[PDB]
Scaffold this active site. Structure first.
Site, PDB file in Angstrom:
ATOM      1  N   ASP A  86      -1.808  -0.180   4.333  1.00  0.00           N
ATOM      2  CA  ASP A  86      -1.684  -0.075   2.891  1.00  0.00           C
ATOM      3  C   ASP A  86      -3.067   0.073   2.251  1.00  0.00           C
ATOM      4  O   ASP A  86      -4.079  -0.295   2.840  1.00  0.00           O
ATOM      5  CB  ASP A  86      -0.969  -1.304   2.335  1.00  0.00           C
ATOM      6  N   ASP A  88      -3.866  -0.520  -1.677  1.00  0.00           N
ATOM      7  CA  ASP A  88      -4.151  -1.483  -2.740  1.00  0.00           C
ATOM      8  C   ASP A  88      -4.283  -2.893  -2.177  1.00  0.00           C
ATOM      9  O   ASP A  88      -3.391  -3.384  -1.483  1.00  0.00           O
ATOM     10  CB  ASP A  88      -3.050  -1.459  -3.811  1.00  0.00           C
TER      11      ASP A  88
HETATM   12 MG   LIG Z   1      -1.223  -3.669  -1.139  1.00  0.00          MG
END
Ligand SMILES: [Mg+2]
Ligand SMILES: [Cl-]
Ligand SMILES: [Cl-]
Length: 295
Positions: A86, A88
């Site tokens: 991922d 963010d």
């Molecule tokens: Mg994240």
């Protein structure tokens, strides 16, 4: 049937002193003890017959109060040839949607929605639609403004990706955030590919909507499945890493799934958590020594 425990500290708070490692390995009647990085990470082959539950429990007691992560896994196949990560709050220190929200004067409002979405208290897609609607009218000019001035790479990220590639792995940045961010971030860090949602614009400003269909928790699971088939492997050959509820699908499917600096509700649902180390922790998870790293 051979297990190995790995202890991991943050290189910026490197507390895994030589004596601490010895004590840790003693606490499990270890066969041996091998240092992947001085003051940072060490491997501890568990005696054959010890359940993975006993160690970790045994090791977290001995280390109680030190900022040192504990993982236990089979030593075979711990080096993986896919990374899916991922973006963010995992490879970058920020939430791209909260940063955009600031340009609309709505950081705190949007960030409180983001936190509940990432904790799993609200479904991802309606949370994303609600937050992105508040970005309606922002000029396309503010994206590079945000990226250049407020986005920072998480420590250890480039080294993790580059070292995995050096060893032939395929690496992908997948994100419920926005392609306008992942494209630059993936190139900064060195990912092979990225896959994210897409903000709609009229040619000058954001419409306030997201290209449909919205990529959420299942879209990450599906991208991992897709990557593994295309490189002729299985998801068992992947290590997956995220911090949010929408990462749990890929975390749970991958052979090694890591909740990285996740809140307890998310970290409760992952079999492997890293609360202290930085992204180099995933190198140590995979057996790499600091000598193997791309410096
Ligand atoms: Mg994240
Ligand atoms: Cl975008
Ligand atoms: Cl699993």
């Amino acid at each position: 049937v051979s297990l190995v425990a790995t202890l991991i500290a943050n290189p910026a708070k490197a507390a895994l002193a030589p004596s601490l490692g010895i004590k840790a390995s003693a606490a499990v009647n270890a066969t041996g003890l091998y240092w992947l990085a001085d003051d940072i990470a060490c491997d501890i082959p568990l005696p054959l017959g010890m359940e993975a539950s006993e160690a970790d429990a045994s090791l977290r007691a001995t280390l109680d109060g030190a900022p040192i992560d504990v993982v236990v896994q089979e030593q075979e196949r711990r080096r993986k040839k896919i990374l899916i990560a991922d973006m963010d709050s995992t490879m970058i220190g920020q939430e791209c949607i909260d940063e955009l929200a600031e340009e609309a004067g709505l950081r705190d409002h949007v960030a409180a929605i983001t936190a509940r979405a990432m904790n799993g208290e609200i479904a991802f897609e309606p949370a994303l639609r609600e937050r992105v609607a508040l970005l309606k009218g922002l000029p396309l000019s503010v994206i590079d403004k945000v990226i250049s001035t407020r986005i920072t790479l998480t420590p250890g990220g480039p080294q993790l990706v580059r070292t995995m590639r050096k060893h032939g792995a395929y690496t992908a940045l997948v994100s419920g955030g926005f392609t306008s961010f992942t494209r630059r971030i993936a190139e900064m860090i060195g990912f092979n590919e990225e896959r994210a949602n897409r903000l709609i614009d009229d040619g000058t400003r954001l419409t306030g909507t997201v290209a449909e269909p919205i990529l959420g928790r299942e879209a990450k699971v599906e991208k991992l499945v897709e990557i593994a088939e295309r490189v002729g492997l299985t998801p068992e050959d992947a290590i997956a890493v995220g911090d949010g509820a929408n990462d749990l699908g890929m975390i749970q499917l991958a052979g090694t799934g890591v909740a990285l600096h996740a809140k307890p509700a998310v970290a409760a649902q992952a079999k492997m958590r890293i609360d202290h180390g930085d992204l180099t922790a995933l190198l140590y998870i995979q057996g790499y020594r600091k000598a193997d790293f791309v410096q």
